[PDB]
Design a protein around this nucleic acid. Structure first.
Ligand SMILES: [Mg+2]
Ligand SMILES: [Zn+2]
Ligand SMILES: [Zn+2]
Lengths: 98, 1338, 83
DNA sequence: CGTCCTTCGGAAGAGATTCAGA
DNA sequence: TCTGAATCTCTTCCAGCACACATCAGGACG
RNA sequence: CCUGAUCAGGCGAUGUGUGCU
C-alpha cells in the first residue's frame, strides 16, 4: 500500500486509515519518540505538521513541490484548534497569550 | 507567533462573548431539502453558510456580494470553514452545577464551602434544603434541612429566615462569601491549633483560597448559567448509505438538554406547581451532568443498545481521545507499507524498494520534473502521463531517486534504531528488500514482518536524514559502546567453515607466494579450502606517527585464512585472522577495525565480510541430517544405573527408614548427577570424534559435524539445545513451580511417549503466556519513563561545581561482578585523583576519562573515583555537558543540544522484553588475601578468638595489592578466628556463628546476680520430659500477670566481692536486659566468661521489580529505621503495638516510635544506634533512605538494584540513563523554614524554583530558606509538573484540567511534548539552535 | 556520492550545525542564488553541499560574509539608480 | 407522510469509622 | 470529651498494527 | 484533497470478532 496525497478525514483534517479507503500510515507515538531521540526537528515538524494537518500549509507544500522549491511553512495543526474548541466548549476558558 | 497558553474559568460574559447566537429548538434538519432548521443545532443564521459563498435561500452566489447578510434569511456569506469556528450558547432557565467541580475527588466546592460532599449532593439534587443567611435564629449557616424540618423551622421562624434547594442555594452561598475574612480566619486557626489532620485540611483550604484571590476568578463561576455548544463541523451529521443520517452522540445529548430546557421554560411560563418544577429542575441538572461528563452518574444513558454514550470528556480522555490519538500520533501522507525480504547484494547504506511504491510515493516529484523539461504542459497532462505510464517516466524516476533518502520503520519501535534512512534501489516486485546486517538492529526476522516507509519532503529533512539517521552512522548503540553490525548467522557459519584446519587435505605443506595464488589454487581445485600451508604475507603496522610501515614475512596458516586476508584493510595485524573465527572473534575484529582505522574502512569491510560469508557458506553446503546427531553408548548404562539407585532408595523408604522429603531430594540429586554425566559423554563424543591418518598412524582432531559447527561457531544455539537433541532433556517443571521426580529420559532423535511430551507441554505453555503478557508490561513501562523524562535537554557547557558520587568496583560476596573500568569509563572526575603513593595530581579534575586514563588507573590501582554524576548537577532547568559524560554513540563529549531523557528512557525500557515475570552458617573465603575489619567493636575472649559487640561488622578481603576483592556481613555475636589485618589461606573458615540464636554475649566477668526476676510473674521453671531441659525460662511480653506488668529483669555482673562492676567509660553497671523468649542458662552465683550467652533468643524479581523500584513502592513489610541517634529503650506494655524510645546524648529527645508486634528487633537496650541503622529486618524503603542518609545513598541503591536485575538477565546498560531517571524522580521538594522567602511553611515546590529563590537572597544580605527533598514515583513526578499539557497527555486528564482551571495555571512552553502538541520546533539540537536565537531575540 | 559525512562533521564540529549550514547552502543553490564551487557528478544539491563542506570552504562565517557582500552590491547598484 | 414523545485485578488518593489516654 | 493511626469505599489502565461485520430514534397520533 | 465533464460528485463513530508483530 502507498499514498502520495488522497482524500482527507472530516472532523480533524488528517489522512484516513486503511487500504480500501485510500489512506496513509500512522506515525505513532513511539516513532515520535524515536525522532526526538535523534536531534531531528524539521523532520518531526513536517511529519506532524505539513504532511498530516494544516490545510493551508499542505496546499502551499504541494505547489512548492510541483514548482521545484523544497520549502515548508509551519502554520498550526488544525486538530489542535479542534482541541481548543472542545475544551472551550466546557466551562474552561483556554486562550493563546501573545 | 505566540508564547505561553493560559487557562481559567469561563465567565458568563466570556461565554456570551464567544457565542454568536442563541440556540432554542431541538430540530436539526428538514430531511426533504437537507437545509437545516431556522436556528436548531445545525444552522445558517448562527454558525454560517453551508457551501462556499452561497446563501441559504438562493440569492447571493458570488464574491461581489460578499459580506452583507441576507435580508430574507440572514446568512453572512463567508467560507464554510466558518462553520468550524463559530459557536453558540444556551440560556439555561435555572442554574446548574458543573460536574467536574463536584465529583473530582477532591471536590472543589466540597472543600471551598467546608461541607460534606454527600450534603452538597443532597442540596443540588433536590431532596433537601440548606440555610442561606439565617441571621439571629436557632439555625446555623451550613445546616441542611428536609421538608418537615423546613416546615418546623418556618413555623418557629415565620420571620426573616431563608433555606433553599438546588443549584440556587449553592450559588447564593458562593456569592455571599467574602474570601478575605476566610483567609484571615484560616491563618488564625492555623496559628491557634496543634492537630495534624486539621493542619492538613487547613493548608489545602488556605492554598486554594490564596491561589484563588491571586487569580481574578469568582466562586460563583463554577455554576453554569449560559452553556456553550460545540461548532457543528466538530460534531458532524454523516450521510449513511440508506435513508436517514448517522449522527454522533453529542447531537442526542444537546437535543435532550434543549428539550428539557424548553419544558422547564414552559413550566415556569404557565406557573407550574412546586413538585413538578422540582422534578423538572432535577431532570435538567441530570441532563447537563450527563452531557459534560457521562458515566460519573449511576446508570449512564445509552443510545440504542448496551453501550453508554460518548460525551465531551470522553472526547479528550483515554487511549482514543485527542491527546493520545490525534495530536501525538498522526496519520501521515507520502507513506506506505509492505512486507520485507532479504536481497543480500545491497550495500548497507541502501535498501530495495518496489517500482510501484516508488511511482506512487513520488508523484509530485515526477510531475515537477516532467513539466520542467517540457514533456507535459499542465497538471492534467502530467497526471495522464503518469497514469498511462509512457517510457519516459522511468527515466525521470531514476533521476528523482538518485540521492533522496527514505525512512524505513518497523511497527514496534522500541529504541531509536527503529527508524533509519536509506537510499532507494528500484525492484520489480512487491516486497521491500532490506540489508541483512540491519535486521538485528531492527530485531526483525523475515517470517512475515511488515515495515513502513516514509518520505522526507523538504530539504532540511533530507539533510537530517543524511547527517543523523543514515544507516552508516548508527554503528554504536546508545546504551553501551558495542557494535550493532554484528554478523549474525550464515556469515559466521561461512567464515567458521572457511578458517579452520583439518589434519590432512589436498595441498599439504606446500609454500605459497601470496594470498592471490592461494585463491588461484582454491578456485581451480588443486588444493582444498582448509589445509595448512606456509604463505608469504605482507602486513602494515602503523607504528609511525600516522605513517604505514610495511613488513612482510612467511606465516604458517591455512588457505582459507589467506583468502580471508584478501579483504582485511591495511592497518589491522595478521594475528586477528589466524584463529578459528567464531562469532565473538569476528565481532571483536570489527571492533578493532573501528578503533584503528575509523569509519569508512569499517563500513566497506562489513560489506566485504557479509559478501564473502554468504559466498563461502554457499560453497560449504553445511546441511543437517538425522545421522549427524550421535547418541552416546554410555547413555543406556547411565540411565540403568540411575534407575538402580532410585530403586535402592525406594527400597530404603518402603520399610520405614527415611522420610518423604529426604527421598525426594535424594532422587533429584542423583538424577541431576546422571544428567550431567550424559551431557559430558555426548559432548566428548562430538568434540573429539573424527580420527584420520596423516602419514600412517591415526590422530584425533576437532570434528566437522554439522550441528557441532553450527553450535561451536555461535550461529544458532548453545550447548543446552544440542544437549536436548542428543542427551536426556533434564527435569521439566510443573504449574505449582515444583519439579517432577521422574525425568524425561528420552531425546528428540528418539521418540517420546505420551506423558513425557505432556510434561514438556507444561513448561511450553508457561513460557508462551509469560511473553504474551510481558509485551504489554514492557510498553507501559517505556511510556511512563519517557513521560517522566524529556523535560531535559543538554543545555549548558559546564556547571562549574565540585559535587559528585564516589564510584567503586562492585562486590557482592561472590566473585567481582563489575570492575572499575566498566563503571568509571568516559565520565569526568570531580576531585583530582590522589595518587596513592604520595600526594600527586594523577588526573586533573576536569578530564574526560577515556580508555587510556582508565588503563592508568588500572596501573596505579585506584579503587574509588569521585566522579561527576547527573544527580548532583547544579544546572537550572537542564543538565550541563561536563556532568553527563561521553555520548556512547559517538566518540567525543556530549553536544550542547542533544536530548538525553528520551534516549535514556528508551535504553532502560527497551530490554524489558528480556525480563522474566513468574543458611546463615559461616563465612568461607575464596582466595588468599588480607583481612580488613569495618565498623567493629570487638573483644578478645578467653579461648583466643575474637567476639563482636557491634551489629554491622563488615569483613573485607584485601588482596596483596591494596584493593578489596571480597566482602561479607558478620552479624552480632560471632566467632572470628582472625584479627585486624591477619593472613588467611585459600578456603579457610574465617568467621562462624549460629543461624538460630541471637546471642546475649558479655563483655566483663565475675559474679552474676538476678534482679527483678519472679518465678510466677517474669520467669518460670520450664522442665522438659525426662529432663530434656532444666533451666529458668523468662516469660514473654503480654502473657505475664498485671501485678508484674511494669517489672523488667536485669542480669547484673558484679565482681568477686559483690561490688558493682561498671561499664568501662561510664558509671552505670554492666547489667543486661532480658527481652521476651529468654532462657536463663548461666545461673545465680556463677562466675562467667567474656562473650557469654546469657539467654537464647530464637526467631520476587523480574519486570515488576523494576516497576517497584522506579515507582518507589514501599514493600509490604518494610524495614524500620532509627530516625535519630541515641540510646534505645522500651515503654508501653504492648497494647497492640510496643513503644520505642530513642534518646540522644547532647541534644533534645522529642522522639518516639511505636513498633509493631509482629516485627522482631535486631537491637538490645544497649545498642546506642546512629540514624541510618535498622531496628527490624526486611527490605529497605527508598523514602527512608532519602530522608535519613542522603541523595547519593538513594541513587546508589536504585542503580545497584536495577543493575542486578538487568545484569542477571545478561543485558548491559550504562549508568547514565538510570541516574538521569533518578534525577527526574527526585525533583520536587518541601519547605521547612521560610525565613525571608515568599513561601508558606508546609508547602511543596520544585527544587529549581526554590534553588533560584534563595540564590538572590544569599548573595544579598537576607536569610535563605530550607528545603527537604522528597522522592516521588514516576507516575507522581509526571502529574506534578510546572505544565499541564504534559500532565494531560499522560494519565488522568480530568483532575489535571480541573486543578489547572481553578488555579489559572499559565503553561509556558519549552518542554518537548508542549511543542510537539502545538506543532513547532523541538528544543533538541536543530530547533535548539533556533530557540537560542529566539531567546536572544526576547 | 557521500555515504558518510564524517569529514563534514570534523570540519563543523557539532553534528547539528552541519544540517543548518548545509540547508542554507542548498537553499542558495536550488532557488537560484549561485552555482557550486565544486564540479558536480550530476548529483543533487544536498550531496553538493556536503561535498563542499568536505572540501572545506563553506561554513557559517563564509556564508555570512558572502551574503553581506551580495547585499552591499544591491546597495551599490541602487546608488547608480539615484544618480 | 409531518410532527413529535419518551458478580473473577493491583495500587495510590481521598473521604468515613474505631480507638485509647487525658 | 477528642484526636491520630488503622479501617472501609470511589477511580483507572492494561503494547502496536491490519482485516470483517452490525448498527445507526422508532411508534404512533395528527 | 480525490474521481469523472470554464463544471459535477465524493469526507464517520461505536462496539464485537479474527489474524499478524
Ligand atoms: Mg517477526
Ligand atoms: Zn439570501
Ligand atoms: Zn553540572
Amino acid at each position: 500500500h502507498a499514498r502520495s496525497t488522497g482524500s482527507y478525514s472530516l472532523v480533524t483534517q488528517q489522512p484516513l486509515g486503511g487500504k480500501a479507503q485510500f489512506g496513509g500510515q500512522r506515525f505513532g507515538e513511539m516513532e515520535v519518540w524515536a525522532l526526538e531521540a535523534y536531534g531531528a526537528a524539521y523532520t518531526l515538524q513536517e511529519m506532524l505538521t505539513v504532511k498530516s494537518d494544516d490545510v493551508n500549509g499542505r496546499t502551499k507544500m504541494y505547489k512548492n513541490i510541483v514548482d521545484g522549491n523544497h520549502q515548508m511553512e509551519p502554520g498550526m495543526p488544525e486538530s489542535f484548534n479542534v482541541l481548543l474548541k472542545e475544551i472551550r466548549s466546557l466551562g474552561i476558558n483556554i486562550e493563546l497569550e501573545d | 507567533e505566540f508564547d505561553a497558553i493560559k487557562i481559567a474559568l469561563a465567565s458568563p460574559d466570556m461565554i456570551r462573548s464567544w457565542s454568536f447566537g442563541e440556540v432554542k429548538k431541538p430540530e436539526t434538519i428538514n430531511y426533504r431539502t437537507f437545509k437545516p432548521e431556522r436556528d436548531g443545532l445545525f444552522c445558517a443564521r448562527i454558525f454560517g453558510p453551508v457551501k462556499d459563498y452561497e446563501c441559504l435561500c438562493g440569492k447571493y452566489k458570488r464574491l461581489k456580494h460578499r459580506g452583507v447578510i441576507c435580508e430574507k434569511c440572514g446568512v453572512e456569506v463567508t467560507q464554510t470553514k466558518v462553520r468550524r469556528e463559530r459557536m453558540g450558547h444556551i440560556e439555561l432557565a435555572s442554574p446548574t452545577a458543573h460536574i467536574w467541580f463536584l465529583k473530582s475527588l477532591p471536590s472543589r466546592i466540597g472543600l471551598l464551602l467546608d461541607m460534606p460532599l454527600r450534603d452538597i449532593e443532597r442540596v443540588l439534587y433536590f431532596e433537601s434544603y440548606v440555610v442561606i443567611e439565617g441571621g439571629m435564629t436557632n439555625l446555623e449557616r451550613q445546616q441542611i434541612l428536609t421538608e418537615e424540618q423546613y416546615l418546623d423551622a418556618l413555623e418557629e421562624f415565620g420571620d426573616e429566615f431563608d433555606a433553599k434547594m438546588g443549584a440556587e442555594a449553592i450559588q447564593a452561598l458562593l456569592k455571599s462569601m467574602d474570601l478575605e475574612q476566610e483567609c484571615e480566619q484560616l491563618r488564625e486557626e492555623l496559628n491557634e491549633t496543634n492537630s495534624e489532620t486539621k493542619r492538613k485540611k487547613l493548608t489545602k483550604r488556605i492554598k486554594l483560597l490564596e491561589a484563588f484571590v491571586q487569580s481574578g476568578n469568582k466562586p460563583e463561576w463554577m455554576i453554569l448559567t449560559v452553556l456553550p455548544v460545540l461548532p457543528p463541523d466538530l460534531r458532524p451529521l454523516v450521510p449513511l448509505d440508506g435513508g436517514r443520517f448517522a449522527t454522533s452522540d453529542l447531537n442526542d445529548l444537546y437535543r435532550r438538554v434543549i428539550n428539557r430546557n424548553n419544558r422547564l421554560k414552559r413550566l415556569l411560563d404557565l406557573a407550574a406547581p412546586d413538585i413538578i418544577v422540582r422534578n423538572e429542575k432535577r431532570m435538567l441538572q441530570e441532563a447537563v451532568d450527563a452531557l459534560l461528563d457521562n458515566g460519573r452518574r449511576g446508570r449512564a444513558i445509552t443510545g440504542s443498545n448496551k453501550r453508554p454514550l460518548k460525551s465531551l470528556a470522553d472526547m479528550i480522555k483515554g487511549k482514543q481521545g485527542r491527546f493520545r490519538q490525534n495530536l501525538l500520533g498522526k496519520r501521515v501522507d507520502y507513506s506506505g507499507r509492505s512486507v520485507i525480504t532479504v536481497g543480500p547484494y545491497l550495500r548497507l547504506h541502501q535498501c530495495g524498494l518496489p517500482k510501484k511504491m516508488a511511482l506512487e510515493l513520488f508523484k509530485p516529484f515526477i510531475y515537477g520534473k516532467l513539466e520542467l523539461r517540457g514533456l507535459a504542459t499542465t497538471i492534467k497532462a502530467a497526471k495522464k502521463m503518469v497514469e498511462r505510464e509512457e517510457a519516459v517516466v522511468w527515466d525521470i524516476l531514476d533521476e528523482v531517486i538518485r540521492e533522496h533518502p527514505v525512512l524505513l520503520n518497523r511497527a514496534p519501535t522500541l529504541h531509536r534504531l527503529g527508524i533509519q534512512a536509506f537510499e532507494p534501489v528500484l525492484i520489480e516486485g512487491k516486497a521491500i528488500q532490506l540489508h541483512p546486517l540491519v535486521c538485528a538492529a531492527y530485531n526483525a526476522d523475515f517470517d512475515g514482518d511488515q515495515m513502513a516507509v516514509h518520505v522526507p519532503l523538504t530539504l532540511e529533512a533530507q539533510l537530517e536524514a543524511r547527517a543523523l539517521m543514515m544507516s552508516t552512522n548508527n554503528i554504536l548503540s546508545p546504551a553501551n559502546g558495542e557494535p550493532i553490525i554484528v554478523p549474525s548467522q550464515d556469515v559466521v557459519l561461512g567464515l567458521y567453515y572457511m578458517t579452520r584446519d583439518c589434519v590432512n587435505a589436498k595441498g599439504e605443506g606446500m609454500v605459497l607466494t601470496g594470498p592471490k595464488e592461494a585463491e588461484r589454487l582454491y578456485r581451480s581445485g588443486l588444493a582444498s579450502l582448509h589445509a595448512r600451508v606456509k604463505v608469504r604475507i605482507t602486513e602494515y603496522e602503523k607504528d609511525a606517527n600516522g605513517e604505514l610501515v610495511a613488513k612482510t614475512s612467511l606465516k604458517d596458516t591455512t588457505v582459507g585464512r589467506a583468502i580471508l586476508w584478501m579483504i582485511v584493510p591495511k592497518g589491522l595485524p595478521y594475528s586477528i585472522v589466524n584463529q578459528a573465527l567464531g562469532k565473538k572473534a569476528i565481532s571483536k575484529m570489527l571492533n578493532t577495525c573501528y578503533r584503528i582505522l575509523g569509519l569508512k574502512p569499517t563500513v566497506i569491510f562489513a560489506d566485504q565480510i557479509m559478501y564473502t560469508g554468504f559466498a563461502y557458506a554457499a560453497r560449504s553446503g553445511a546441511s543437517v541430517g538425522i545421522d549427524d546427531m550421535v547418541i552416546p553408548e554410555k547413555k543406556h548404562e547411565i540411565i540403568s544405573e540411575a534407575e538402580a539407585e532410585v530403586a535402592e532408595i525406594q527400597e530404603q523408604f518402603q520399610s520405614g527408614l527415611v522420610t518423604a522429603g529426604e527421598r525426594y531430594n535424594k532422587v533429584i540429586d542423583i538424577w541431576a548427577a546422571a544428567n550431567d554425566r550424559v551431557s559430558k559423554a555426548m559432548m566428548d563424543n562430538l568434540q573429539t570424534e573424527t580420527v584420520i591418518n596423516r602419514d600412517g598412524q591415526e590422530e584425533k582432531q576437532v570434528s566437522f559435524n554439522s550441528i557441532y559447527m553450527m553450535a561451536d561457531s555461535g550461529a544458532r544455539g548453545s550447548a543446552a539445545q544440542i544437549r536436548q537433541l542428543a542427551g536426556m532433556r533434564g527435569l521439566m517443571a510443573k504449574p505449582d513451580g515444583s519439579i517432577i521426580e521422574t525425568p524425561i529420559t528420552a531425546n528428540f532423535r528418539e521418540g517420546l511417549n505420551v506423558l513425557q511430551y505432556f510434561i514438556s507441554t507444561h513448561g511450553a505453555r508457561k513460557g508462551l503466556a509469560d511473553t504474551a503478557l510481558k509485551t504489554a508490561n514492557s510498553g507501559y513501562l517505556t511510556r511512563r519513563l519517557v513521560d517522566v523524562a524529556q523535560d531535559l535537554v543538554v543545555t549548558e557547557d559546564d556547571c562549574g561545581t565540585h559535587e559528585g558520587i564516589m564510584m567503586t568496583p562492585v562486590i557482592e560476596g561472590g566473585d567481582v561482578k563489575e570492575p572499575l573500568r566498566d563503571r568509571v569509563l568516559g565520565r569526568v572526575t570531580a576531585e583530582d585523583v590522589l595518587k596513592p603513593g604520595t600526594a600527586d595530581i594523577l588526573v586533573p579534575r576536569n578530564t574526560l576519562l577515556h580508555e587510556q586514563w582508565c588503563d592508568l588507573l588500572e596501573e596505579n590501582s585506584v579503587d574509588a573515583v569521585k566522579v561527576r554524576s547527573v544527580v548532583s548537577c547544579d544546572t537550572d532547568f537542564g543538565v550541563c555537558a561536563h556532568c553527563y559524560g561521553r555520548d556512547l554513540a559517538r566518540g567525543h563529549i556530549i553536544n550542547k543540544g542533544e536530548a538525553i531523557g528520551v534516549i535514556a528512557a528508551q535504553s532502560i525500557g527497551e530490554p524489558g522484553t528480556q525480563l522474566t515475570m513468574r543458611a546463615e552458617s559461616s563465612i568461607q573465603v575464596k582466595n588468599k588475601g588480607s583481612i580488613k575489619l569495618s565498623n567493629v567493636k570487638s573483644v578478645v575472649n578467653s579461648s583466643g578468638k575474637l567476639v563482636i559487640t557491634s551489629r554491622n561488622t563488615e569483613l573485607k578481603l584485601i588482596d596483596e595489592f591494596g584493593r578489596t576483592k571480597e566482602s561479607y556481613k558478620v552479624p552480632y555475636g560471632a566467632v572470628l578466628a582472625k584479627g585486624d589485618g591477619e593472613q588467611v589461606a585459600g578456603g579457610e573458615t574465617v568467621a562462624n556463628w549460629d543461624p538460630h540464636t541471637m546471642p546475649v554475649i558479655t563483655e566483663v566477668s565475675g559474679f552474676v546476680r538476678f534482679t527483678d526476676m519472679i518465678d510466677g510473674q517474669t520467669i518460670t521453671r520450664q522442665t522438659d520430659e525426662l529432663t530434656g531441659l532444666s533451666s529458668l525460662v523468662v516469660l514473654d511480653s503480654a502473657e505475664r500477670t498485671a501485678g508484674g506488668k511494669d517489672l523488667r529483669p536485669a542480669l547484673k555482673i558484679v565482681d568477686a566481692q559483690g561490688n558493682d562492676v561498671l561499664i568501662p567509660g561510664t558509671d552505670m553497671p554492666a547489667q543486661y536486659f532480658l527481652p521476651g523468649k529468654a532462657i536463663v542458662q548461666l545461673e545465680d552465683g556463677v562466675q562467667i566468661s567474656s562473650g557469654d550467652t546469657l539467654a537464647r533468643i530464637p526467631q520476587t524479581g523480574g519486570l515488576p521489580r523494576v516497576a517497584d523500584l522506579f515507582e518507589a513502592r514501599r514493600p509490604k513489610e518494610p524495614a524500620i529505621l532509627a530516625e535519630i541517634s541515641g540510646i534505645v529503650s522500651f515503654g508501653k506494655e504492648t497494647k497492640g503495638k510496643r513503644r520505642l524510645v530513642i534518646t540522644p546524648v547532647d541534644g533534645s529527645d522529642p522522639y518516639e516510635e511505636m513498633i509493631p508486634k509482629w516485627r522482631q528487633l535486631n537491637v538490645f537496650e544497649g545498642e546506642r544506634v546512629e540514624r541510618g541503622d535498622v531496628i527490624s529486618d526486611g527490605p529497605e524503603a527508598p523514602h527512608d533512605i532519602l530522608r535519613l542518609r542522603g541523595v547519593h545513598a538513594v541513587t546508589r541503591y536504585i542503580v545497584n538494584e536495577v543493575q542486578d536485575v538487568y545484569r542477571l538477565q545478561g543485558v548491559k546498560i550504562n549508568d547514565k540513563h538510570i541516574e538521569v531517571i533518578v534525577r527526574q524522580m527526585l525533583r520536587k521538594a518541601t519547605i521547612v523554614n521560610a525565613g525571608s522567602s515568599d513561601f508558606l511553611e508546609g508547602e511543596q515546590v520544585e527544587y529549581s524554583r526554590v534553588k533560584i529563590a534563595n540564590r538572590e537572597l544569599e548573595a544579598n544580605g537576607k536569610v535563605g530558606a530550607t528545603y527537604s527533598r522528597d522522592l516521588l514515583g514516576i507516575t507522581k513526578a509526571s502529574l506534578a509538573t510546572e505544565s499541564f499539557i504534559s500532565a494531560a497527555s499522560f494519565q488522568e486528564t480530568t483532575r489535571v484540567l480541573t486543578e489547572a482551571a481553578v488555579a489559572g495555571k499559565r503553561d509556558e512552553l519549552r518542554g518537548l511534548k508542549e511543542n510537539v502538541i502545538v506543532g513547532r520546533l523541538i528544543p533538541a539540537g536543530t530547533g535548539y539552535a533556533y530557540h537560542q536565537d529566539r531567546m536572544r531575540r526576547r | 556520492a557521500r555515504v558518510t559525512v564524517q569529514d563534514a562533521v570534523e570540519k563543523i564540529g557539532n553534528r547539528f550545525d552541519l544540517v543548518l549550514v548545509a540547508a542554507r547552502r542548498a537553499r542558495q543553490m536550488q532557488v537560484g542564488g549561485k552555482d557550486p564551487l565544486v564540479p558536480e557528478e550530476n548529483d543533487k544539491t544536498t550531496v553538493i553541499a556536503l561535498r563542499e563542506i568536505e572540501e572545506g570552504l563553506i561554513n557559517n562565517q563564509i556564508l555570512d560574509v558572502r551574503e553581506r557582500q551580495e547585499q552591499q552590491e544591491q546597495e551599490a547598484a541602487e546608488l547608480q539608480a539615484v544618480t
